[PDB]
Amino acid sequence: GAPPIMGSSVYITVELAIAVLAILGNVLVCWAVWLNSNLQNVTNYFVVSLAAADIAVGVLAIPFAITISTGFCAACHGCLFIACFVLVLTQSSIFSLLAIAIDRYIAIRIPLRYNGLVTGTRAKGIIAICWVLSFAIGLTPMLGWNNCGQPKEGKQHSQGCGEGQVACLFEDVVPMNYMVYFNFFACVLVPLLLMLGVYLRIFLAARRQLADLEDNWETLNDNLKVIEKANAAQVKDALTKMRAAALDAQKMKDFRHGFDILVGQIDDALKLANEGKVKEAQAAAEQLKTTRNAYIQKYLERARSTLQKEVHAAKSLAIIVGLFALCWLPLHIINCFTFFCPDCSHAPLWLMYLAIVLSHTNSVVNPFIYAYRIREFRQTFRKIIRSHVLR
Ligand SMILES: CC(C)CCC[C@@H](C)[C@H]1CC[C@H]2[C@@H]3CC=C4C[C@@H](O)CC[C@]4(C)[C@H]3CC[C@]12C
Ligand SMILES: CC(C)CCC[C@@H](C)[C@H]1CC[C@H]2[C@@H]3CC=C4C[C@@H](O)CC[C@]4(C)[C@H]3CC[C@]12C
Ligand SMILES: CC(C)CCC[C@@H](C)[C@H]1CC[C@H]2[C@@H]3CC=C4C[C@@H](O)CC[C@]4(C)[C@H]3CC[C@]12C
Ligand SMILES: Cc1ccc(C(=O)Nc2nc(-c3ccco3)c(C(=O)C3CCOCC3)s2)cn1
Ligand SMILES: CCCCCCCC/C=C\CCCCCCCC(=O)OC[C@H](O)CO
Ligand SMILES: CCCCCCCC/C=C\CCCCCCCC(=O)OC[C@H](O)CO
Ligand SMILES: CCCCCCCC/C=C\CCCCCCCC(=O)OC[C@H](O)CO
Ligand SMILES: CCCCCCCC/C=C\CCCCCCCC(=O)OC[C@H](O)CO
């Protein structure tokens, strides 16, 4: 078994490489939102909170990981802080990702209430509350749910640690019942399933609304055929069904003018039908075809286009949740094997290190997803790189 420092040097060089990239990419997300008022919306205040957490992975969590890989002597509680700090940043990340999912759900379910419900001031209060709770949840072991009462006495003597000191190793100070039941099941796995459920409700809500728009459009076009097939109470029933469906599409000016004309043309055809002038009502009904073209088809296409953008945007933010789950799951599955299967062989050291590195890599990927999938970030990223790196 080779000298530890050789494999130690690979791990550390890789961790520092990740730290550099996590800082630069996330500082760019923050710089972007700062410079571009098109990126200054409540969704992006949670994107910045998540960027801040990923900066703190590079500045603090990776230096801590490096430090704790040495097994240096420390007072147990100072060891606990170094061991648990990254759990604060993961919890802060779960909260930001959950808030973004709920924000997007509100934006698609009740867009007319969104601006009055989700403001900057409330979003900042929520972010502040979520950072407090993330410190409380991630440093719980420091409240006394910890192995500091039961030091490894053989490691403590072989490394020449002093009174009160331990060999600082994550798995010697953080209980696995905490890491599995409390950190994984309650604080990570339940919130990811909840976010899965909200994204499912966004995609369904979008699909039902696109359907309703296609449906309304088909009633008009269908009922034009029901009118144009020569009875007068027959035309009345088709016209009564188009007046419901014109209203339902409605429920500023270029917009609200098309529908005024439309209900105008329908009520005109209605008056003729009540009187009983079938032929007049049929001619009255063909004017509508022209109002459909120059107005109604424009509203429909615009409503479809907005919903499709919400679907694409919601796909992009869900890719970010998937990549979080992917990057952290291996470390959680390893703790689950350690806890639930004490007869199972432990993961080799090299694979522990790979699981840790994969977890840090999550703090690099988000800036790439914004660059690839969101025009406004991408364009802002060029302006900033062209100005400040080109020059
Ligand atoms: C503003 C930010 C950057 C400040 C960062 C402070 C960090 C580096 C400080 C705060 C608390 C500190 C720990 C507190 C106590 C101990 C126990 C001791 O036996 C070994 C050092 C150790 C483990 C310290 C390491 C450094 C530490 C983690
Ligand atoms: C929805 C998905 C992503 C959640 C992840 C499921 C996790 C919790 C599952 C997947 C594989 C599972 C492990 C598979 C095998 C064993 C061996 C057994 O002797 C103890 C339980 C243990 C260790 C399981 C614990 C739970 C486990 C880690
Ligand atoms: C999901 C993508 C990113 C790939 C990662 C897959 C994860 C789930 C795999 C990669 C290597 C795997 C580990 C490899 C070896 C062992 C030792 C054995 O005694 C128990 C299972 C355990 C601890 C495995 C658990 C699951 C594991 C961590
Ligand atoms: C047999 C064995 C040894 C070590 C471990 C172990 O270290 N699990 C571990 N799980 C996690 C974890 C985090 C989230 C879910 O899980 C770790 C870390 O994020 C540490 C990496 C170094 O900086 C200190 C934090 S460390 C588990 N089982
Ligand atoms: C989401 C997309 C992420 C995709 C990116 C891939 C993730 C892995 C990254 C780099 C590989 C680093 C390999 C080196 C890992 C450490 C291995 C090691 O140092 O060996 C330890 C030795 O055994 C101790 O004694
Ligand atoms: C704004 C950017 C600032 C970012 C800040 C960068 C931090 C400095 C870089 C690496 C620290 C590496 C951690 C030091 C680990 C030392 C391990 C140790 O102390 O070993 C004791 C010895 O093993 C007893 O026997
Ligand atoms: C890329 C820009 C980076 C920004 C500037 C930061 C430079 C820090 C350089 C090296 C950190 C390595 C620290 C070495 C600490 C580990 C010493 C050690 O391994 O302890 C002895 C033995 O392993 C006990 O078990
Ligand atoms: C923007 C602000 C930048 C802030 C930058 C912060 C970087 C933190 C660096 C290292 C973590 C601390 C490493 C802890 C080193 C412990 C060494 C120790 O305690 O040694 C005791 C004894 O020597 C055992 O043998």
Ligand SMILES: CCCCCCCC/C=C\CCCCCCCC(=O)OC[C@H](O)CO
């Ligand atoms: C100690 C254990 C703590 C562990 C941390 C667990 C986090 C769970 C917290 C909140 C879940 C929120 C439920 C999300 C369900 C969807 C809500 C929704 O759809 O809200 C729309 C409404 O219109 C809004 O105004």
Ligand code: NA
């Ligand atoms: Na993160």
